[PDB]
Every structure is written in structure tokens, then in C-alpha cells.
Amino acid sequence: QSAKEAIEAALADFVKAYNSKDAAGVASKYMDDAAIFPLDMARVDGRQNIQKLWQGLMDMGVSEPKLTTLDVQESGDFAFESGSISLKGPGKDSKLVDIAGKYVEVWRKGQDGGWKLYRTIANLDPAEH
Numbered sequence: 001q002s003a004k005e006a007i008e009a010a011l012a013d014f015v016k017a018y019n020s021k022d023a024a025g026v027a028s029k030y031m032d033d034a035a036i037f038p039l040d041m042a043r044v045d046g047r048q049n050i051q052k053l054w055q056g057l058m059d060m061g062v063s064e065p066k067l068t069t070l071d072v073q074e075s076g077d078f079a080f081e082s083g084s085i086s087l088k089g090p091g092k093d094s095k096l097v098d099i100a101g102k103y104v105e106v107w108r109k110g111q112d113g114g115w116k117l118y119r120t121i122a123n124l125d126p127a128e129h
């Protein structure tokens with residue numbers, strides 16, 4: 001019932017879609033005009049480009065995403081969330097290592113009543129060029 005519990009549930013489906021290598025399913029968790037802002041990197045705009053991003057990560061051999069949601073605050077048709085992510089991905093030596101990052105993001109109640117991602121700002125913890 002809680003917005004926090006609703007988002008954590010949505011992120012649970014997010015992880016399942018990714019581990020099934022279903023980039024379209026992953027992208028369906030986003031608003032059509034959603035945007036991702038990786039810090040010191042190019043922003044990714046629109047559902048299809050976001051699908052391309054997650055598909056690209058799958059192709060790289062990125063796997064086992066683990067999401068840790070901190071607090072979630074509701075404001076009108078928006079929900080504000082902060083959290084952290086850990087996953088397995090290739091280093092500059094092509095070897096698979098544990099990679100971590102932090103994020104804040106804004107969800108929006110779509111046409112349905114369900115929560116969909118709208119804005120995400122994220123960074124990879126220092127540790128590929």
C-alpha cells in the first residue's frame with residue numbers, strides 16, 4: 001500500500017525483467033518521456049533510448065542488479081526516491097567485477113494508477129574509461 005512498498009515492488013519487477021534479458025519489459029517501467037541523467041555522461045531521453053541503454057548493458061555482460069531503496073516520499077502524482085545499486089560488469093581488463101553506484105529518482109503516477117520512472121540521476125562509484 002505504501003508508496004515506498006509500491007516502488008520497491010516495481011523495482012522487483014524491474015530486476016526480474018532485466019535478469020530475463022527483457023529490455024522492452026525493463027523499458028515499460030518508464031514513462032514515455034522519461035529521462036536518465038548519468039552524471040558526467042550524456043543524458044538518455046525517451047523510452048526506446050532507455051531500452052537501448054539497458055539492452056546495451058545486457059550485451060556488455062552486465063548482470064545481477066541489486067537495488068537498495070532508502071526513503072520514499074510522495075508529493076502529488078510524484079514520488080521521490082533515493083537509493084543505491086550494485087551489479088556485475090566488465091572492467092577495463094574485461095574481467096567481471098562488482099560495480100556500485102548511487103541514485104536519486106522521481107516516479108510518476110501514470111495512466112493506470114501504477115508508478116513509472118520519470119527522472120533518474122545516477123553515478124558510478126569510483127573504482128572502464
Ligand SMILES: C=C1CC[C@H](O)C/C1=C/C=C1\CCC[C@]2(C)[C@@H]([C@H](C)CCCC(C)(C)O)CC[C@@H]12
Nearest residue numbers: 036038062067085089090099101103120122128
Ligand atoms: C554498469 C556499467 C558498468 C560497466 C560500464 O561502465 C557500463 C556501466 C554503466 C553504468 C551505468 C551508466 C548508465 C546509468 C546507470 C545504468 C545507472 C542506473 C540508471 C541507475 C538507476 C537504476 C534504477 C533502476 C534504480 O533506476 C546505474 C549504473 C549506470
